[PDB]
Ligand binder design. Structure first.
Ligand SMILES: CC(=O)SCCNC(=O)CCNC(=O)[C@H](O)C(C)(C)COP(=O)(O)OP(=O)(O)OC[C@H]1O[C@@H](n2cnc3c(N)ncnc32)[C@H](O)[C@@H]1OP(=O)(O)O
Ligand SMILES: Nc1ncnc2c1ncn2[C@@H]1O[C@H](COP(=O)(O)OP(=O)(O)O)[C@@H](O)[C@H]1O
Ligand SMILES: [Mg+2]
Ligand SMILES: [Mg+2]
Lengths: 472, 95, 191, 95
């Protein structure tokens, strides 16, 4: 029934879904804004169409009606939103399913119970999943002070909608929660309007564990495995590893079974990710991502399961075991370990601000145990400030975690992007650290280590020689 | 007979219209087929681009088929070498 | 009934698929053995029955041999090079970058691509996706021949023999490629 | 005192020769350090290349280190744009 698929996204994830659809024998349709006219994903599909003409090139990809119109005009049976943009947008899902197009994602019920953290925490506690203690539902500033008084200190300010530095502040001393609440509410009304905040009991040095969940419409729900994303800078993930080599296997199995029981309770379908905070053999639910993550590639590498192909075929309404070929939950293997590093244009010598400009050099590595998912990073590409800073995410996988670390170090030293500044020296510093190699890195590992921000001087002598030769 | 001969010449099975055009204009149809094999479907170009080519630092868009648009930018025309060849620095589809 | 025919005392071109299905770095272990290190003490390779078989893998050598010209190795300038990627794809590129001038001195090989998956059919499908995604222009390649071999049902069943290529004349039937970007650029440059 | 002042200006710990060069010619040494950051070690270039740059289609080799020889070829010089910038089409190390 499904023979053509549109991707309502851009960059690397659009190319990933295009490759999965081409492996599945489906035709592909791309969409692109005017300012993304040189993106690789435009020319990687059979059909490409301009969307959001006259708008800023972030609202063009958020233009639900234009994407729906392009999907109807091109005769696309289904729509895959990728991650970000309209991936978790419920209105986009309603319009896609109402127009007669298959939505590659979970059900709309999953969309609103996981679109905000209050209802997600409600589903977690009625699923008997051990959550994080905190305020129940929409509390105001006085409720924030009340929870700070009785439950103690430190607390964490978190809005219901979004996150990732948007409406997520901290409070360790008195009269901080008032301005934290004001800033979080201002950031919430900047993006999604009036959004309630729930105050969380903050955890000293937590480990961030994500569990990847695959479920079909027949009710079969399996976890591939878990991945550790605790290496974070300003609570934003930079390096993700899989599996959590710093945790005992029985504890990881227990966390995965808890995520499985939660997703089974909500009757989850397609691909989803359950995030946890972990400290001394006690895990706490945080949120569920109702889509595929940027770091699903390491899960694919350590499990052997094509997540994007599986979610396309789940959107085709196939059974996980008879039709896809995915084995039982115990028969899911563990093929060594894998590390994902996202190479972006964030310049660590300038406060990780994303650099722009033309890329005049691009060399990518290869060989054994290397996976590349490139976005728009080719030679001659002009980096625009409109879109995300990501150039190419590279994953290294091996039987041993130390071999994965040394392969990632070889990859980061082999990598060459000239013209824009990258976060590659910062990634090299994080890879070289003894906490990361041991695998016991926490959420505060980067902020408590000043040695990660010392960068050796690089004498790019080819660039300097070419500059002098051009000058003379 | 002329259908088999034309299939031998143009390298594929021709339609009735192609056989008829080969009958009416034998040399002209073969020259058109050679021009199609060398330059492709030039009918999709706009008339100023079809007639005068491409200017320096010009940006054109060619729709070869539905959903497929070629972004072509001429960036630099190189000097001729001793063999008489010039290198044109095109930017096709961003590359 | 198996019979010995040869031993090659070297690391082979096709070691990459063995690395993919076993998880063992062959070149790294070769260097470590050249350092006089034990296979199980310092290298860390397990014993014989603990060697894992991680699915199936397929290696395709993309060369400059032109199957429309009797597999003669083509030369010239590579004006376009796009390499694929993603899940299950391994690339071992030689000299195939854009702007590289292919010389008749060395071997015809441009790039080695290896595709690995838990199921052999998935490996065949991903190899077909790679061969269609791969774009090397300005020189002739054996990519349509590789596509024809991939699409054959003997290959997908795994019952191919050494006479399978010669006994099948349908592998040498190649569809016409439009190549409209190169033709458009050629006409624009000419005018 | 002057070594700590020099270390801030040049971005690394200076040697005894760099400190004593900064005493005599403070502006000349800092202008040399600025040129070292922009153009690098131009002392390794051949003297016709040092003074006259490159010709069109010229192929030079610069040995920046033992075992490292840059292969530099100038393929085409672009025309200046409205901003006054020229784009030079080099071929550094085959690329
Ligand atoms: C991510 C993946 O899975 S890619 C797998 C194969 N690729 C695709 O299916 C989508 C892209 N399709 C193509 O590139 C070609 O049309 C193919 C592979 C189907 C074969 O066609 P060919 O005969 O070899 O060349 P074609 O006539 O189509 O040339 C058209 C040009 O427009 C490009 N193009 C292809 N798709 C688009 C698009 N949606 N929009 C704009 N340009 C496009 C092509 O890359 C090609 O440029 P090129 O010379 O660099 O290769
Ligand atoms: N109470 C808490 N204690 C410690 N860390 C927290 C707490 N709440 C959130 N965090 C951190 O904030 C980060 C963002 O969490 P989350 O909201 O799930 O993702 P996003 O912000 O992308 O939606 C997490 O990585 C987590 O480590
Ligand atoms: Mg999150
Ligand atoms: Mg032999």
């Amino acid at each position: 029934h499904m023979k053509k698929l549109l991707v309502a996204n851009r960059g690397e994830i659009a190319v990933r879904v295009f490759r999965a659809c081409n492996e599945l024998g489906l035709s592909t349709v791309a969409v692109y804004a005017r300012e993304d006219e040189y993106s690789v994903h435009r020319f990687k599909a059979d059909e490409s169409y301009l969307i959001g003409q006259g708008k800023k090139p972030i609202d063009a990809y958020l233009d639900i009606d234009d994407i729906i119109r392009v999907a109807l005009e091109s005769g696309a049976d289904a729509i895959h939103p990728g991650y970000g943009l309209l991936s978790e947008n419920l209105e986009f899902a309603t319009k896609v399913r109402a127009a007669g197009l298959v939505f590659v994602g979970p059900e709309l019920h999953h969309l609103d119970i996981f679109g905000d953290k209050i209802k997600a925490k409600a589903a977690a506690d009625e699923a008997k999943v051990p959550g994080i203690p905190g305020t129940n539902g929409a509390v105001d500033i006085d409720g924030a002070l009340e929870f700070a008084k009785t439950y103690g200190y430190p607390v964490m300010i978190k809005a219901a909608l979004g996150g990732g530095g948007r409406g997520m502040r901290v409070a360790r001393n008195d009269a901080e929660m008032h301005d934290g609440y004001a800033r979080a509410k201002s950031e919430a009304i900047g993006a999604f309007g009036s959004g309630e905040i729930y105050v969380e009991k903050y955890i000293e040095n937590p480990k961030h564990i994500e569990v990847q969940i695959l479920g079909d419409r027949h009710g079969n729900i399996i976890h591939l495995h878990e991945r550790d994303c605790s290496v974070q800078r300003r609570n934003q993930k930079v390096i993700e590893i899989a599996p959590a080599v710093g945790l005992s296997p029985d504890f990881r199995n227990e966390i995965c079974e808890a995520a499985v029981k939660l997703c089974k309770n909500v009757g989850y379908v397609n691909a989803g990710t359950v995030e946890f905070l972990v400290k001394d053999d006690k895990f706490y639910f945080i949120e569920v991502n109702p889509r595929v993550q940027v770091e699903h590639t390491i899960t694919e590498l350590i499990t052997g399961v094509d997540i994007v192909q599986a979610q396309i075929l789940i959107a085709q309404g196939k059974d996980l075991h008879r039709e896809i070929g995915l084995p039982a939950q115990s028969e899911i293997p563990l093929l060594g370990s894998a590390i994902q590093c996202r190479i972006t244009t964030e310049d660590p010598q300038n406060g990780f601000l994303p650099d722009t400009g033309k890329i005049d050099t691009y060399r990518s590595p290869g060989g054994f145990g290397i996976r590349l998912d490139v976005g728009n990073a080719y030679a001659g590409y002009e980096v625009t400030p409109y879109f995300d800073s990501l150039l190419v995410k590279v994953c290294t996988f091996a039987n041993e975690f130390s071999d994965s670390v040394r392969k990632m170090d070889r990859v980061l030293h082999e990598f060459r992007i000239r013209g824009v500044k990258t976060n590659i020296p910062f990634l090299i510093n994080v890879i070289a650290n003894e906490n990361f190699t041991s695998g016991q890195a926490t959420t505060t590992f980067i902020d408590n280590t000043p040695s990660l921000f010392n960068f050796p001087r690089l004498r790019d002598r080819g660039t300097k020689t070419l500059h002098y030769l051009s000058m003379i | 007979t002329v259908k088999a001969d034309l299939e031998q010449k143009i390298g594929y099975e021709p339609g009735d219209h192609e056989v008829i055009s080969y009958i009416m204009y034998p040399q002209v149809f073969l020259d058109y087929q050679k021009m199609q094999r060398e330059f492709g479907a030039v009918t999709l170009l706009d008339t100023p681009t079809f007639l005068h080519g491409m200017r320096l630092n010009e940006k054109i868009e060619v729709q070869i088929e539905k959903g497929k648009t070629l972004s072509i930018r001429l960036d630099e025309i190189g000097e001729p070498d001793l063999a008489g060849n010039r290198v044109l620095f095109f930017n096709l589809n961003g590359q």
